[PDB]
Design an enzyme around this catalytic site. Sequence first.
Site, PDB file in Angstrom:
ATOM      1  N   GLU A  56       0.870  -1.174   0.000  1.00 20.17           N
ATOM      2  CA  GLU A  56       0.000   0.000   0.000  1.00 20.17           C
ATOM      3  C   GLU A  56       0.904   1.221   0.000  1.00 20.17           C
ATOM      4  OE1 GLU A  56      -2.728   0.404   3.341  1.00 20.17           O
ATOM      5  OE2 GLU A  56      -2.544   2.583   3.248  1.00 20.17           O
TER       6      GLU A  56
ATOM      7  N   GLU B 215      -1.746  12.093   2.316  1.00 24.21           N
ATOM      8  CA  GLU B 215      -2.586  11.682   3.439  1.00 24.21           C
ATOM      9  C   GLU B 215      -2.313  12.508   4.687  1.00 24.21           C
ATOM     10  OE1 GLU B 215      -1.743   7.842   5.239  1.00 24.21           O
ATOM     11  OE2 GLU B 215      -3.864   7.524   5.693  1.00 24.21           O
TER      12      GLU B 215
END
Length: 298
Positions: free
Chosen positions: A115, A120
Amino acid sequence: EFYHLVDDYGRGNGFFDKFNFFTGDDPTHGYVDYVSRDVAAGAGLIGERDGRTYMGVDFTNPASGRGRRSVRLESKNTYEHGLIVIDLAHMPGSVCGTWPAFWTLGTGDWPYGGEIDIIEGVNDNTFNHMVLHTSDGCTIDNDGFTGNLKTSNCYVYAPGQDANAGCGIEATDPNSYGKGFNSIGGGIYATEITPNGISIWFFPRGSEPGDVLGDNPNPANWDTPAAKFAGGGCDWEGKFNAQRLIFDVTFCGDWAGNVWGIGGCASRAANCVDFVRDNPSAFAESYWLVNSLRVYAP
Ligand SMILES: OC[C@H]1O[C@@H](O[C@H]2[C@H](O)[C@@H](O)[C@H](O)O[C@@H]2CO)[C@H](O)[C@@H](O)[C@@H]1O
Ligand SMILES: OC[C@H]1O[C@@H](O)[C@H](O)[C@@H](O)[C@@H]1O
């Protein structure tokens, strides 16, 4: 011919046609209600704004049920090796209670396919976080990037690191995320995935190289990346497989909700959920505005 274009996402409906809309309960347990494409379109959560592709959240109605309405798009196409370049005019702001992310997810059971968190953060964060989440046996070296290394072990359950912290590098530019990023009109995030590692460059509006948006970008001549993940402490080829691109904005949950009380949002309400449910107007800045999204392959 270092890199060639293999997938241009275009804009508007042509752009949304390349994504599946996730509607299941939030895996990160946030106070969010992921809606279908039809519902999103009917609620103004997705569309086009002067040529840019828009993806936002409900900032009008008090929330109920699973949580505040938002969308989570996951690309239909997947890429094993390549260069992902996103040019944003705006990203979800540094809004209390929110948890936006532009990232990639491997195939199969998480985190075995790997991932990559490109963009973010949570609540009123100022700096962007670039993180990798992998299965056990993957650590990175501390050199080759401009950001600040926070955690070196990419294993989701790495001993000595908060659960699922992964190996993260924090950008040093205050305009790399949310509020600052939007004040300068955004910028470009380029992510390269090779069998030797992963690199992520951040070019604030106006500082991008001449080939970054073209048909043959060559990262080899770009400035130092903001984050670089590499070294003999990881089998880069085997830790990551075919990656799909994901756009989402969740609320509270495992990260944003968990750190609500220790940060600057603590004064907004006793709990993250109460704030998100009762203050719709606060989330007007929680949207993505995409100029372009293009994927290249070696
Ligand atoms: O970055 C420090 C922060 O990590 C939090 O874990 C996050 C992780 O950072 C994020 O990349 C991933 O997508 O979600 C996990 C949470 O599931 C951790 O919860 C925080 O305590 C920590 O300060
Ligand atoms: O959605 C991708 C994965 O994200 C992780 O943070 C969750 O714990 C998993 O349950 C989920 O499958």
